[PDB]
């Protein structure tokens, strides 16, 4: 018999992105080649099958630094991290291949789906 | 020029509630009289003006235990904590006064609004 506030989930995510922008309560740095990205482990796990696996691991759960595979493109990661915190994906002709490869590695199935559909339309 | 995934914010919140249920990465206990509630500080701040103020404080941000005012009803808090993590509010005749008082203390304006509207309809 609950009532539901339609905008609540969006409002929560907006405030989680505000916390990320202000670097409040961030508990991990994701290292992608020469670049570093601060984030909240809980948000990363909620969005990515890869981070969900990493941070449920009894040893990796306590690491303050995670290094991604050297093949991972920093811009692709940046675009996906922005998506995690906003629901918005900056998908462009010049970045689609890097975004799809990063989304496959991060196990973000909905992003992979759409990248596949956008590539298929251009061929 | 971003595209947006409609269900992303809801999916994030569902996974944050799964983390809470499994007690993964919870970093605070909220004490309400004889009862204890584990939660994630980031979610509490994202939902509540009171917790936003508490956890931006340079000393309180590091506390693992927060004690609420003894006038706060544990069931009212439980209902509001469930709402924070799900967007669903279990508002009933028998709990509405406790829910509204807890929502006022926690500075959860949308919940206060609706409690006011539901009480006005019954008078």
């Amino acid at each position: 018999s609950c009532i539901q506030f339609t905008r609540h989930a969006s409002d929560v995510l907006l405030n989680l992105n505000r916390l990320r922008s202000r670097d409040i309560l961030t508990d991990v740095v994701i290292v992608v080649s020469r670049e570093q990205f601060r984030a909240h482990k809980t948000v990363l796990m909620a969005c990515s099958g890869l981070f969900y696996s990493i941070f449920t691991d009894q040893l990796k759960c306590n690491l303050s630094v995670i290094n991604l595979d050297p093949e991972i493109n920093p811009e692709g990661f940046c675009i996906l991290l922005d998506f995690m915190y906003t629901s918005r994906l900056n998908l462009r002709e010049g970045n689609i291949m890097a975004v799809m490869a990063t989304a496959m590695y991060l196990q973000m199935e909905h992003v992979v789906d759409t990248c596949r559909k956008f590539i298929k339309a251009s061929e | 020029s971003c595209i947006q995934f409609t269900r992303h914010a809801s999916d994030v919140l569902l996974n944050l509630n799964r983390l809470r249920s499994r007690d993964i990465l919870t970093d605070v206990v909220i004490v309400v009289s004889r009862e204890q509630f584990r939660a994630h500080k980031t979610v509490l701040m994202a939902c509540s003006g009171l917790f936003y103020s508490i956890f931006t404080d340079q000393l309180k941000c590091n506390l693992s235990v927060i004690n609420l005012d003894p006038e706060i009803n544990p069931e009212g808090f439980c209902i509001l904590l469930d709402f924070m993590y799900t967007s669903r509010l279990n508002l009933r005749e028998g709990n509405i006064m406790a829910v509204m008082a807890t929502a006022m203390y926690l500075q959860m304006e949308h919940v206060v609004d609706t409690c006011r509207k539901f009480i006005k309809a019954s008078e």
């Binding site: 009532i3 539901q4 339609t6 | 609706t114």
Partner: peptide, 4 residues
Amino acid sequence: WVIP
């Protein structure tokens, strides 16, 4: 607010 809605009836979900």
